[PDB]
């Protein structure tokens, strides 16, 4: 039984890139023109791309022309679809499909299809951070120095800049490399050490700038 | 002059799949053995895969052999890396690199590299659902269970260990922006059975061997 | 299966110094050896190939020697821009092997970290998530171990670390570790602690707090 299987689908932010592959069983792709087709939410099918034998000719739906590329690997029997500059309306189930018949001709229908892989483009290309204080307390104060900071959480994409007291406070500041969470969102912390004697008299505010979303946040970090 | 650029990096769950590509500028890949290399969090580089001219020979690092395949598209100058059965230790920055020199020999160093693309594999390959009641509140009442934040599909839902089938609707799951699934199962019943007949949805998430029974009562 | 071993893994030096990174192979690789420079976040740059050949454009202060099983990269008159990671590589027609890498850093005296712990903010907690943050401040060398314990139970799989680059002024490093729990999980326990091990500390330092104060 001829079989096809797609790999690679998932969630993508608008503007993002995603690459799909297609593998087969019980036939060789070399003699077949191979195709990509997608079912949009409304239920209709849309032809996306075709690649001829020998990779000689490639054609694309106007809607994706200039943004997608289809490739083939005849020796190991794979087909690829590169999707760039993605749009919400690219959201669909993508199928890999073979052009073929019992005996090949100059024009055959799509006689075998993969089960399909789901590709979902979210409208949001960006997300602004939540900012939480890392408040000074007895657990962060030892002798003449106290540490305090801000936790900048669940934003996308990099980077965010952090300044303290609108730039007046630079000495002792450490803003750490962001980390990517299993949620697909970044988070980082910025901290500063200051004299314990200054808490309660001197105000401390972290200024967070997420340029990619043009979002700005000012957060007062106080004891307790 | 010479440039390389990778696309496709992302966050994938253990056991999952991810495909990367590499494009170039100011040269053709055809005469070049093309390669994939990754820099692991420790800081060291690891050779990952090589694809020779005419795509005749392909070689992989032992750690990824059997799981990764490299491909090339000479006419449009692209190279691909398929990664399957992915593991946490596949987490790394992936670079596309060519073997080259002013005159090509049988063994040249990696003279041109792409900037890299970040690939992250989270450790959990599955996640069981959280189940919440949809509590009822005339003549015909409705109640159900909200099965939330699981991965991958599917879950199955029965009501009262299967004794209750009439009036049941279990909806197709939706994929939330979090990359986790959610669905609801509802049943309609006589407002006169609320507090006489007990209602319990039985959720099963085979992929995480999770079973959850939840009593739905009013208020 | 040739093993490439660099030495040392971290090499501490000062500007103007002359330093030597060694790369040894577990068996002879003739002169099929290349050296690469890489700075954080950037692509590796080819410096030397065939053991001793300098790539055009590469300053003459970089020099490679060796053959068979022993290879050296020497930088004469180390400059600020030379602070980076260096990788040796055995390259064959259709495969390669890299060393573990050598990071060249600014030399300074050992410095124990200052350790601080931060409970989750009430605001975050209310939103259903508890981030607990452990800060290691201004220490040298970079190697440090941080372990989370919740009611004395060692934690695994629920924290992430981030380290700063060497500080332009005192040449020290700083590190942040975040333990992440659900609100519900967080409330099942009392004592939260991070335990820090470092070469400059006489013994480990443990900072802790009790949930609820």
């Amino acid at each position: 039984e001829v079989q096809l299987v797609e790999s690679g689908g998932g969630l993508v932010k608008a503007g993002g890139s995603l690459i799909l592959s297609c593998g087969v069983s019980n036939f060789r792709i070399s003699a077949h023109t191979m195709n990509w087709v997608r079912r949009v939410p409304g239920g209709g099918l849309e032809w996306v791309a075709s690649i001829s034998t020998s990779s000689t000719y490639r054609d694309y739906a106007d809607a994706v022309k200039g943004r997608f590329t289809v490739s083939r690997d005849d020796l190991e029997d794979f087909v690829y679809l590169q999707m760039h500059k993605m749009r919400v309306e690219d959201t669909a189930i993508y199928y890999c499909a073979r052009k073929g018949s019992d005996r090949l001709s100059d024009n055959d229908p799509f006689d075998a299809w993969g089960p399909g892989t789901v590709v979902t483009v979210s409208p949001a290309s960006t997300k602004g951070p939540s900012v939480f204080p890392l408040a000074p307390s007895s657990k962060s104060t030892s002798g003449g120095t106290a540490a305090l900071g801000c936790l900048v959480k669940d934003y996308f994409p990099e980077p965010v800049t952090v300044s303290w007291n609108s730039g007046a406070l630079t000495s002792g500041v450490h803003t750490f490399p962001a980390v990517l969470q299993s949620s697909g969102l970044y988070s980082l912390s910025s901290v500063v050490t200051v004299p314990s004697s200054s808490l309660g008299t001197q105000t401390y505010i972290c200024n967070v700038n997420h340029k990619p979303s043009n979002t700005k946040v000012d957060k007062k970090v106080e004891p307790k | 002059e010479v440039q390389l650029v990778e696309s496709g990096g992302g966050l994938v769950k253990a056991g999952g799949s991810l495909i990367l590509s590499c494009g170039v500028s100011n040269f053709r890949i055809s005469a070049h053995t093309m390669n994939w290399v990754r820099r692991v969090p420790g800081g060291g580089l690891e050779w990952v895969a090589s694809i020779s001219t005419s795509s005749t020979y392909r070689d992989y690092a032992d750690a990824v052999k059997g799981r990764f395949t490299v491909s090339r598209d000479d006419l449009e100058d692209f190279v691909y890396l398929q990664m399957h059965k992915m593991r946490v230790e596949d987490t790394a920055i992936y670079y596309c690199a060519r073997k080259g020199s002013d005159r090509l020999s049988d063994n040249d160093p990696f003279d041109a590299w792409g900037p890299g693309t970040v690939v992250t594999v989270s450790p959990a390959s599955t996640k069981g659902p959280s189940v919440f009641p949809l509590a009822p509140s005339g003549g015909t009442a409705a109640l159900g269970c909200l099965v939330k934040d699981y991965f991958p599909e599917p879950v199955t839902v029965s009501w009262n260990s299967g004794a209750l089938t009439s009036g049941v609707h279990t909806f197709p799951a939706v994929l939330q922006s979090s990359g986790l699934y959610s669905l609801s199962s509802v049943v309609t019943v006589p407002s006169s059975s609320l507090g006489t007949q007990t209602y319990i949805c039985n959720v099963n998430h085979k992929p995480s061997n999770t079973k959850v029974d939840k009593k739905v009562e009013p208020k | 299966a040739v093993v490439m071993t660099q030495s040392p893994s971290t090499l501490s030096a000062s500007v103007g110094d002359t330093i030597t990174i060694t790369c040894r192979a577990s068996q002879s690789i003739e002169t099929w050896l290349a050296w690469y420079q890489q700075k954080p976040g950037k692509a590796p740059k080819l410096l030397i190939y065939k053991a001793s050949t300098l790539k055009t454009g590469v300053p003459s202060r970089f020099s490679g020697s060796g053959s068979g099983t022993e290879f050296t990269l020497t930088i004469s008159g180390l400059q600020f821009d030379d602070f980076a990671t260096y990788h040796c590589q055995h390259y064959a027609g259709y495969s390669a092997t890299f060393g573990q890498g050598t990071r060249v850093e600014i030399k300074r005296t050992v410095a124990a970290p200052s350790v601080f712990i931060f409970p989750p903010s009430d605001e975050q907690l209310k939103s259903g998530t508890a981030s607990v943050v452990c800060l290691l401040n201004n220490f040298y060398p970079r190697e440090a171990k941080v372990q989370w314990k919740v009611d004395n139970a060692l934690q695994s799989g629920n924290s992430q670390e981030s380290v700063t680059e060497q500080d332009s002024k005192d040449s020290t490093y700083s590190l942040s570790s975040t333990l992440t729990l659900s609100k519900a999980d967080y409330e099942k326990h009392k004592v939260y602690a991070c335990e820090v091990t470092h070469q400059g500390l006489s013994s480990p330092v443990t900072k802790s707090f009790n949930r609820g104060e």
């Binding site: - | 392909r58 070689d59 992989y60 059997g66 490299v70 398929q82 | 259709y94």
Partner: peptide, 16 residues
Amino acid sequence: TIXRSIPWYTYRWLPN
């Protein structure tokens, strides 16, 4: 005799 990469590596050539 098809040389493949996945799910089994079956290339048989050895570089000279």
